[PDB]
Every structure is written in C-alpha cells, then in structure tokens.
Amino acid sequence: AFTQLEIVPQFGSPNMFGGEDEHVRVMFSNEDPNDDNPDAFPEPPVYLADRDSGNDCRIEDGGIWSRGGVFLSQDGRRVLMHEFSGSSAELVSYDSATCKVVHREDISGQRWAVDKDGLRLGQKCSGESVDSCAKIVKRSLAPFCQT
Amino acid sequence: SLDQCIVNACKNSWDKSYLAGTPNKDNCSGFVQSVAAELGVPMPRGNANAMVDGLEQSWTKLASGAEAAQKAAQGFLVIAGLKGRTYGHVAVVISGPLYRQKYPMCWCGSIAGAVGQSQGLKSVGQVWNRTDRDRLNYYVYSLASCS
C-alpha cells in the first residue's frame, strides 16, 4: 500500500529536493539552470536512504522522474515512481534497500491516480484528473508492493 | 528576432484543439499539426509515430540538436521526433540556450501530463529521458517561414 511522498527543498544541500517518512528518504538533484522549483528530474541518480538499517543506495538509470509522482510503501520496503519520456509514461517500483527495479508497467496514454486503494487508469479524458475520463480501469498494486 | 513567426505560431497553437475533443497541450502530434497549419507548412498525417515516419521520407534531417537551434533561429520550422513503441513524441524546436550544452529549447504538448509539456521553458532533454534524448531525429522544412 503506497502513500504519496511530497518532495520539497532540503535546506543545507543546495539544489536538493526530497522527502521522508519513518522508513525511507528519497532524494533528487535539480540540474535545471532556469527553474529553482522544478516539477521533474531528468538527470539521475536518485538517492534512497533505508532509515531502518541506515544504509543508502542509488538508482543510476531511469526515465524522467515526476516530482510528486513518488510514493512510499507502508512496510517501507518499496518506492513507487512515475517516470516519463516524451509521450510515454510508466510506473516503476523499486526496492528501497537495493535500488533494484522490482516492477515496471507501461501507463502510456492513460491518465492515472494511485493511493492505498490501488491504481486507476483512464482513457478519453478532458482534464488532468483521472476522474475526467470516460473510461476508468482499476489495476492491482500488489505486484508493485510484494508484501 | 527572426524566429518570432514560429514562437507566435506556438503560443497561439497551445490552447487550440486540432483533434475535435482532445486539447493540443495533451497531444504532442496535435500541437505540431496546429503550428504547421498556422504557418502553412504541409505535414504528414496520423499519430506521432506515423508523422515521424512521414518526416523521415520527405523532410531533410539535421546532424545535431545544436544544428536544429541554428535553423530555428533562422525562422525554419524544426521538428524533433522519436518513434515510440505505441506513443511517439514530436516537438517544435525554438532558438535559445542549449540545455547541457547539447539539447535545444522546445514547445510541445504531451499526454504524459504537465511534466511532459513545454511552453518554451524546457529543452528536448527535459522532455525526453536520458536514454531517449540522444536518439532524437531533427527534421527541417525546405523553405523558410519568416523570411
């Protein structure tokens, strides 16, 4: 079960955007020279701190990370991430301890929303929100959670 | 500047809707169709994937995105484009500072979300991901637009 993580500036580390809960801290760096308040992170790495063991890893390669497309699992074992390229999109789930990819799924052309309930995927929309879609499909986040 | 006729064509084609229902800003192929129709520049038909196929046949292609900015600053319509597995992407290239000293500024709508969109504030390297951005093809129209 994933809960949304807000990604905000980290005072003390110039150009660092991140957030955390009891279990996991996620961090990007902003290499965009023009915007001091980005919405996306094209350039890796992504830093994941496993706050239980106190170790860290790095996601070294990856599609453009959506700020506020970041979700942490209840057990703290998984991190869910929205990653796009051009007009493609996908939801990737990573192992918070090893940074390994655990599940990938194409989401291209769909509008989307996740919460504790699951994943909602809509076609034929008329706005940014998935509730604007004439077709809405529920998909299980269990293969992302692996609990 | 000289490339103004194109930036104007972009700014106006943004809130338009080439495809009856879906707004241009949520459809990269629809936005390019609106810009080119304003400028009177013949465009291949179909989705982004079909358009790129179409450009590769008739339109001459440039060696680099740096060279794309050169043609763009000269008032030439320049389309950056990469074929997808199902959803390809296409963008208008405009003059201005190159991101990472390599990738040209752009205007494009995107079904991915606001993240994938650019109103001249993101380069093709901030729209396409790390892997993709180096596989882009840059196509230019034979004749000038603002001469």
mmCIF file of C-alpha atoms in Angstrom:
data_model
loop_
_atom_site.group_PDB
_atom_site.id
_atom_site.type_symbol
_atom_site.label_atom_id
_atom_site.label_comp_id
_atom_site.label_asym_id
_atom_site.label_seq_id
_atom_site.Cartn_x
_atom_site.Cartn_y
_atom_site.Cartn_z
ATOM 1 C CA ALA A 1 0.000 0.000 0.000
ATOM 2 C CA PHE A 2 1.561 3.238 -1.243
ATOM 3 C CA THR A 3 1.252 6.705 0.275
ATOM 4 C CA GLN A 4 2.265 9.835 -1.680
ATOM 5 C CA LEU A 5 5.539 11.478 -0.654
ATOM 6 C CA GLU A 6 5.879 15.232 -1.026
ATOM 7 C CA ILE A 7 9.257 16.267 -2.476
ATOM 8 C CA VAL A 8 10.463 19.620 -1.117
ATOM 9 C CA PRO A 9 13.749 21.625 -0.913
ATOM 10 C CA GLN A 10 16.359 20.343 1.551
ATOM 11 C CA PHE A 11 17.975 23.281 3.369
ATOM 12 C CA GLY A 12 21.702 22.633 3.763
ATOM 13 C CA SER A 13 22.122 20.855 0.442
ATOM 14 C CA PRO A 14 21.828 23.399 -2.391
ATOM 15 C CA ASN A 15 19.529 22.258 -5.240
ATOM 16 C CA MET A 16 18.404 19.077 -3.433
ATOM 17 C CA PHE A 17 14.759 18.049 -3.422
ATOM 18 C CA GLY A 18 13.474 15.225 -1.248
ATOM 19 C CA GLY A 19 11.131 13.880 1.407
ATOM 20 C CA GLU A 20 10.906 11.141 4.028
ATOM 21 C CA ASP A 21 8.825 9.019 6.377
ATOM 22 C CA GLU A 22 9.659 6.727 9.325
ATOM 23 C CA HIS A 23 11.181 4.176 6.941
ATOM 24 C CA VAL A 24 12.628 5.802 3.785
ATOM 25 C CA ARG A 25 14.155 9.051 2.435
ATOM 26 C CA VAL A 26 14.064 9.823 -1.304
ATOM 27 C CA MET A 27 16.234 12.496 -2.980
ATOM 28 C CA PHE A 28 16.805 14.096 -6.376
ATOM 29 C CA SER A 29 19.102 16.892 -7.513
ATOM 30 C CA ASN A 30 17.962 19.796 -9.685
ATOM 31 C CA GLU A 31 20.301 20.381 -12.613
ATOM 32 C CA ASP A 32 17.837 22.654 -14.450
ATOM 33 C CA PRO A 33 19.614 26.024 -14.553
ATOM 34 C CA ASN A 34 16.482 28.163 -15.100
ATOM 35 C CA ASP A 35 13.838 26.823 -12.715
ATOM 36 C CA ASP A 36 14.507 26.837 -8.951
ATOM 37 C CA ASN A 37 11.209 24.994 -8.374
ATOM 38 C CA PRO A 38 11.127 22.059 -10.854
ATOM 39 C CA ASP A 39 8.327 19.548 -11.451
ATOM 40 C CA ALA A 40 10.568 16.817 -12.875
ATOM 41 C CA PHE A 41 14.062 15.301 -12.567
ATOM 42 C CA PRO A 42 15.624 14.240 -15.917
ATOM 43 C CA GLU A 43 19.116 13.519 -14.524
ATOM 44 C CA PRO A 44 19.957 10.579 -12.223
ATOM 45 C CA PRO A 45 20.912 9.436 -9.653
ATOM 46 C CA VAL A 46 18.005 9.081 -7.252
ATOM 47 C CA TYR A 47 19.136 8.604 -3.643
ATOM 48 C CA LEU A 48 17.254 6.155 -1.395
ATOM 49 C CA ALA A 49 18.064 6.001 2.320
ATOM 50 C CA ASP A 50 16.879 2.897 4.163
ATOM 51 C CA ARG A 51 16.367 4.546 7.550
ATOM 52 C CA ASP A 52 15.968 1.186 9.355
ATOM 53 C CA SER A 53 19.429 -0.217 8.525
ATOM 54 C CA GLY A 54 20.965 3.232 7.941
ATOM 55 C CA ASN A 55 22.348 2.306 4.515
ATOM 56 C CA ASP A 56 21.869 4.058 1.165
ATOM 57 C CA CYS A 57 21.726 3.153 -2.497
ATOM 58 C CA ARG A 58 21.412 4.936 -5.819
ATOM 59 C CA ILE A 59 19.056 4.488 -8.757
ATOM 60 C CA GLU A 60 21.618 5.059 -11.528
ATOM 61 C CA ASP A 61 19.497 4.965 -14.700
ATOM 62 C CA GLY A 62 15.869 5.992 -15.263
ATOM 63 C CA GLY A 63 13.182 7.921 -17.179
ATOM 64 C CA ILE A 64 12.299 11.494 -16.224
ATOM 65 C CA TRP A 65 11.172 11.361 -12.591
ATOM 66 C CA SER A 66 7.992 13.245 -11.737
ATOM 67 C CA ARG A 67 8.293 15.319 -8.592
ATOM 68 C CA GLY A 68 5.193 14.344 -6.635
ATOM 69 C CA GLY A 69 4.952 11.125 -8.632
ATOM 70 C CA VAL A 70 6.760 9.493 -5.700
ATOM 71 C CA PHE A 71 5.114 7.021 -3.317
ATOM 72 C CA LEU A 72 6.396 5.063 -0.292
ATOM 73 C CA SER A 73 5.075 1.656 0.766
ATOM 74 C CA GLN A 74 3.574 1.111 4.220
ATOM 75 C CA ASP A 75 6.187 -1.515 5.194
ATOM 76 C CA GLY A 76 8.833 0.858 3.817
ATOM 77 C CA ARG A 77 10.231 -1.845 1.536
ATOM 78 C CA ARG A 78 9.129 -0.328 -1.811
ATOM 79 C CA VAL A 79 9.173 3.061 -3.521
ATOM 80 C CA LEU A 80 6.757 3.723 -6.392
ATOM 81 C CA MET A 81 7.802 6.180 -9.092
ATOM 82 C CA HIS A 82 6.214 7.856 -12.093
ATOM 83 C CA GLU A 83 8.752 8.052 -14.938
ATOM 84 C CA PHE A 84 8.034 9.505 -18.382
ATOM 85 C CA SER A 85 9.828 10.113 -21.663
ATOM 86 C CA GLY A 86 8.314 12.205 -24.441
ATOM 87 C CA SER A 87 4.709 10.980 -24.537
ATOM 88 C CA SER A 88 5.465 7.659 -22.798
ATOM 89 C CA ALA A 89 4.866 7.091 -19.101
ATOM 90 C CA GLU A 90 5.334 4.242 -16.660
ATOM 91 C CA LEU A 91 5.046 3.317 -13.023
ATOM 92 C CA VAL A 92 8.176 1.747 -11.598
ATOM 93 C CA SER A 93 8.524 0.157 -8.168
ATOM 94 C CA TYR A 94 11.973 -0.034 -6.590
ATOM 95 C CA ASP A 95 13.391 -1.963 -3.647
ATOM 96 C CA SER A 96 14.094 0.676 -1.002
ATOM 97 C CA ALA A 97 17.111 -1.300 0.258
ATOM 98 C CA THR A 98 18.864 -2.274 -3.015
ATOM 99 C CA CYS A 99 17.505 0.271 -5.562
ATOM 100 C CA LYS A 100 16.745 -2.680 -7.864
ATOM 101 C CA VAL A 101 13.681 -2.433 -10.131
ATOM 102 C CA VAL A 102 11.000 -4.807 -8.796
ATOM 103 C CA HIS A 103 8.138 -3.994 -11.171
ATOM 104 C CA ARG A 104 7.627 -1.928 -14.307
ATOM 105 C CA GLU A 105 4.367 -1.111 -16.061
ATOM 106 C CA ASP A 106 3.515 0.912 -19.163
ATOM 107 C CA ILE A 107 0.956 3.653 -18.468
ATOM 108 C CA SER A 108 1.273 5.491 -21.781
ATOM 109 C CA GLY A 109 -1.776 7.447 -22.971
ATOM 110 C CA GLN A 110 -3.685 6.829 -19.733
ATOM 111 C CA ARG A 111 -4.375 9.415 -17.094
ATOM 112 C CA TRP A 112 -3.556 7.965 -13.685
ATOM 113 C CA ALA A 113 -4.011 8.056 -9.911
ATOM 114 C CA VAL A 114 -2.674 5.931 -7.071
ATOM 115 C CA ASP A 115 -3.485 5.617 -3.387
ATOM 116 C CA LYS A 116 -3.940 2.909 -0.734
ATOM 117 C CA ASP A 117 -6.969 1.614 -2.719
ATOM 118 C CA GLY A 118 -4.950 0.832 -5.884
ATOM 119 C CA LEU A 119 -4.143 2.155 -9.365
ATOM 120 C CA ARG A 120 -6.774 3.853 -11.511
ATOM 121 C CA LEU A 121 -6.167 4.231 -15.252
ATOM 122 C CA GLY A 122 -8.380 6.290 -17.552
ATOM 123 C CA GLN A 123 -8.738 6.805 -21.303
ATOM 124 C CA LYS A 124 -10.732 9.510 -23.132
ATOM 125 C CA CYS A 125 -10.181 12.292 -20.597
ATOM 126 C CA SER A 126 -10.915 16.044 -20.757
ATOM 127 C CA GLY A 127 -8.627 17.262 -17.951
ATOM 128 C CA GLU A 128 -5.516 16.349 -15.941
ATOM 129 C CA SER A 129 -7.513 14.386 -13.314
ATOM 130 C CA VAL A 130 -8.389 10.715 -13.986
ATOM 131 C CA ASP A 131 -11.990 11.451 -12.892
ATOM 132 C CA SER A 132 -12.253 13.341 -16.195
ATOM 133 C CA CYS A 133 -12.014 10.058 -18.108
ATOM 134 C CA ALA A 134 -14.963 8.376 -19.834
ATOM 135 C CA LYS A 135 -13.196 5.030 -19.333
ATOM 136 C CA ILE A 136 -11.658 4.116 -15.958
ATOM 137 C CA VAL A 137 -9.813 0.868 -15.177
ATOM 138 C CA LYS A 138 -8.692 -0.333 -11.734
ATOM 139 C CA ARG A 139 -5.409 -2.249 -11.529
ATOM 140 C CA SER A 140 -3.877 -4.019 -8.525
ATOM 141 C CA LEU A 141 -0.718 -2.543 -6.981
ATOM 142 C CA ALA A 142 0.122 -5.933 -5.427
ATOM 143 C CA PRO A 143 2.870 -6.700 -7.964
ATOM 144 C CA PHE A 144 4.401 -3.309 -7.008
ATOM 145 C CA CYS A 145 4.067 -3.984 -3.260
ATOM 146 C CA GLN A 146 5.181 -7.644 -2.983
ATOM 147 C CA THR A 147 4.226 -7.986 0.685
ATOM 148 C CA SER B 1 14.108 38.311 -33.600
ATOM 149 C CA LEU B 2 13.666 36.422 -36.901
ATOM 150 C CA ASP B 3 12.268 33.212 -35.362
ATOM 151 C CA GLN B 4 9.301 35.159 -33.930
ATOM 152 C CA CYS B 5 6.791 33.940 -36.545
ATOM 153 C CA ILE B 6 7.289 30.388 -35.187
ATOM 154 C CA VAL B 7 7.192 31.228 -31.449
ATOM 155 C CA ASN B 8 3.970 33.161 -32.183
ATOM 156 C CA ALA B 9 2.622 30.117 -34.047
ATOM 157 C CA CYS B 10 3.493 28.032 -30.977
ATOM 158 C CA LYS B 11 1.980 30.339 -28.353
ATOM 159 C CA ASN B 12 -1.289 30.519 -30.328
ATOM 160 C CA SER B 13 -1.475 26.812 -31.199
ATOM 161 C CA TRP B 14 -1.218 25.924 -27.492
ATOM 162 C CA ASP B 15 -4.856 26.403 -26.432
ATOM 163 C CA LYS B 16 -6.162 25.186 -29.798
ATOM 164 C CA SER B 17 -7.574 21.701 -30.460
ATOM 165 C CA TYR B 18 -6.595 20.059 -33.760
ATOM 166 C CA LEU B 19 -8.376 16.826 -32.831
ATOM 167 C CA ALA B 20 -12.021 17.680 -32.066
ATOM 168 C CA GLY B 21 -12.115 16.510 -28.432
ATOM 169 C CA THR B 22 -8.557 16.387 -27.083
ATOM 170 C CA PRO B 23 -6.760 19.739 -26.452
ATOM 171 C CA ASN B 24 -3.379 20.289 -28.140
ATOM 172 C CA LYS B 25 -1.494 20.520 -24.818
ATOM 173 C CA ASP B 26 -2.462 16.896 -24.098
ATOM 174 C CA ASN B 27 -1.495 15.685 -27.578
ATOM 175 C CA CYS B 28 2.025 16.282 -28.982
ATOM 176 C CA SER B 29 1.053 15.343 -32.548
ATOM 177 C CA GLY B 30 -1.972 17.673 -32.430
ATOM 178 C CA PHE B 31 0.140 20.654 -31.332
ATOM 179 C CA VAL B 32 2.639 20.239 -34.186
ATOM 180 C CA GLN B 33 -0.305 19.995 -36.606
ATOM 181 C CA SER B 34 -1.678 23.316 -35.306
ATOM 182 C CA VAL B 35 1.657 25.189 -35.509
ATOM 183 C CA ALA B 36 2.357 23.979 -39.065
ATOM 184 C CA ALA B 37 -1.212 24.733 -40.213
ATOM 185 C CA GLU B 38 -0.827 28.327 -38.972
ATOM 186 C CA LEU B 39 2.471 28.727 -40.835
ATOM 187 C CA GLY B 40 1.175 26.929 -43.939
ATOM 188 C CA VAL B 41 3.687 24.095 -43.797
ATOM 189 C CA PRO B 42 2.464 20.717 -45.174
ATOM 190 C CA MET B 43 2.536 17.938 -42.552
ATOM 191 C CA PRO B 44 2.290 14.128 -42.797
ATOM 192 C CA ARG B 45 -0.946 12.695 -41.383
ATOM 193 C CA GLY B 46 -1.714 10.359 -38.463
ATOM 194 C CA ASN B 47 -0.278 9.930 -34.966
ATOM 195 C CA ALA B 48 3.217 10.960 -33.784
ATOM 196 C CA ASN B 49 4.674 7.599 -34.885
ATOM 197 C CA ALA B 50 3.191 7.984 -38.383
ATOM 198 C CA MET B 51 4.306 11.625 -38.583
ATOM 199 C CA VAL B 52 7.951 10.757 -37.812
ATOM 200 C CA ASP B 53 7.832 8.040 -40.484
ATOM 201 C CA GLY B 54 6.445 10.719 -42.826
ATOM 202 C CA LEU B 55 9.151 13.260 -41.980
ATOM 203 C CA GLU B 56 11.928 10.680 -42.459
ATOM 204 C CA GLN B 57 10.774 10.225 -46.087
ATOM 205 C CA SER B 58 10.498 13.811 -47.354
ATOM 206 C CA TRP B 59 11.991 16.291 -44.857
ATOM 207 C CA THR B 60 15.789 16.569 -44.647
ATOM 208 C CA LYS B 61 17.276 15.752 -41.233
ATOM 209 C CA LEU B 62 19.967 17.635 -39.304
ATOM 210 C CA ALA B 63 23.026 16.065 -37.617
ATOM 211 C CA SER B 64 22.546 17.551 -34.136
ATOM 212 C CA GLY B 65 20.055 19.345 -31.901
ATOM 213 C CA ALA B 66 22.593 22.148 -31.738
ATOM 214 C CA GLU B 67 22.171 22.477 -35.516
ATOM 215 C CA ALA B 68 18.390 22.363 -35.022
ATOM 216 C CA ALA B 69 18.571 25.544 -32.921
ATOM 217 C CA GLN B 70 20.560 27.204 -35.738
ATOM 218 C CA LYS B 71 17.810 26.544 -38.302
ATOM 219 C CA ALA B 72 15.160 27.545 -35.740
ATOM 220 C CA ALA B 73 16.844 30.903 -35.089
ATOM 221 C CA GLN B 74 16.720 31.404 -38.867
ATOM 222 C CA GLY B 75 12.914 31.108 -38.973
ATOM 223 C CA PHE B 76 12.776 27.489 -40.166
ATOM 224 C CA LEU B 77 10.228 25.012 -38.769
ATOM 225 C CA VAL B 78 12.215 22.283 -36.986
ATOM 226 C CA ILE B 79 10.571 19.127 -35.637
ATOM 227 C CA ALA B 80 12.350 16.937 -33.104
ATOM 228 C CA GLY B 81 10.848 13.446 -33.090
ATOM 229 C CA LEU B 82 11.377 9.918 -31.791
ATOM 230 C CA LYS B 83 9.240 6.846 -32.541
ATOM 231 C CA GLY B 84 7.623 5.118 -29.562
ATOM 232 C CA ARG B 85 6.507 1.519 -29.117
ATOM 233 C CA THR B 86 2.967 2.924 -29.333
ATOM 234 C CA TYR B 87 3.137 6.600 -28.319
ATOM 235 C CA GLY B 88 5.836 8.550 -30.156
ATOM 236 C CA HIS B 89 6.658 12.180 -29.411
ATOM 237 C CA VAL B 90 7.128 15.324 -31.511
ATOM 238 C CA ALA B 91 8.156 18.851 -30.538
ATOM 239 C CA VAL B 92 8.722 22.242 -32.128
ATOM 240 C CA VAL B 93 12.354 23.344 -31.782
ATOM 241 C CA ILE B 94 12.994 27.011 -30.940
ATOM 242 C CA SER B 95 16.114 29.189 -30.617
ATOM 243 C CA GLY B 96 17.775 29.870 -27.262
ATOM 244 C CA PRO B 97 20.213 28.390 -24.674
ATOM 245 C CA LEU B 98 21.038 24.689 -25.078
ATOM 246 C CA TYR B 99 20.470 22.518 -22.011
ATOM 247 C CA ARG B 100 23.627 20.587 -21.017
ATOM 248 C CA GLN B 101 25.357 22.414 -23.925
ATOM 249 C CA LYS B 102 23.638 19.972 -26.287
ATOM 250 C CA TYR B 103 19.820 19.929 -26.358
ATOM 251 C CA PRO B 104 17.679 22.693 -27.989
ATOM 252 C CA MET B 105 14.723 24.543 -26.428
ATOM 253 C CA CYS B 106 11.244 23.333 -27.400
ATOM 254 C CA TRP B 107 7.448 23.696 -27.400
ATOM 255 C CA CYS B 108 5.393 20.502 -27.104
ATOM 256 C CA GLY B 109 2.174 19.117 -25.652
ATOM 257 C CA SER B 110 2.236 15.677 -24.030
ATOM 258 C CA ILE B 111 -0.314 13.073 -22.915
ATOM 259 C CA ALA B 112 2.092 12.181 -20.071
ATOM 260 C CA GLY B 113 0.992 15.240 -18.057
ATOM 261 C CA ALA B 114 2.122 18.817 -17.362
ATOM 262 C CA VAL B 115 5.554 17.322 -16.655
ATOM 263 C CA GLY B 116 5.950 16.300 -20.319
ATOM 264 C CA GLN B 117 4.651 19.643 -21.592
ATOM 265 C CA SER B 118 6.838 22.613 -22.546
ATOM 266 C CA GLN B 119 5.822 26.182 -23.406
ATOM 267 C CA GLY B 120 9.403 27.055 -24.377
ATOM 268 C CA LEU B 121 10.664 26.526 -20.824
ATOM 269 C CA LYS B 122 12.101 23.016 -21.266
ATOM 270 C CA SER B 123 14.576 21.612 -23.794
ATOM 271 C CA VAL B 124 14.097 18.311 -25.628
ATOM 272 C CA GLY B 125 16.448 16.857 -22.993
ATOM 273 C CA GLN B 126 13.996 17.755 -20.218
ATOM 274 C CA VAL B 127 11.057 16.257 -22.125
ATOM 275 C CA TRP B 128 12.701 13.025 -23.321
ATOM 276 C CA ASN B 129 14.607 10.882 -20.804
ATOM 277 C CA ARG B 130 18.378 10.279 -20.589
ATOM 278 C CA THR B 131 18.322 7.236 -22.899
ATOM 279 C CA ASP B 132 15.964 8.722 -25.472
ATOM 280 C CA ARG B 133 17.284 12.282 -25.808
ATOM 281 C CA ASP B 134 20.369 11.054 -27.688
ATOM 282 C CA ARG B 135 18.338 9.091 -30.261
ATOM 283 C CA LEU B 136 16.212 12.026 -31.460
ATOM 284 C CA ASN B 137 15.945 12.938 -35.120
ATOM 285 C CA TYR B 138 15.793 16.605 -36.103
ATOM 286 C CA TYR B 139 13.892 17.489 -39.291
ATOM 287 C CA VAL B 140 13.725 20.873 -41.028
ATOM 288 C CA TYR B 141 11.402 22.247 -43.721
ATOM 289 C CA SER B 142 12.977 23.043 -47.114
ATOM 290 C CA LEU B 143 11.640 26.636 -47.303
ATOM 291 C CA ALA B 144 11.740 29.494 -44.751
ATOM 292 C CA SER B 145 8.759 30.702 -42.719
ATOM 293 C CA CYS B 146 9.669 34.238 -41.623
ATOM 294 C CA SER B 147 11.888 35.479 -44.492
#
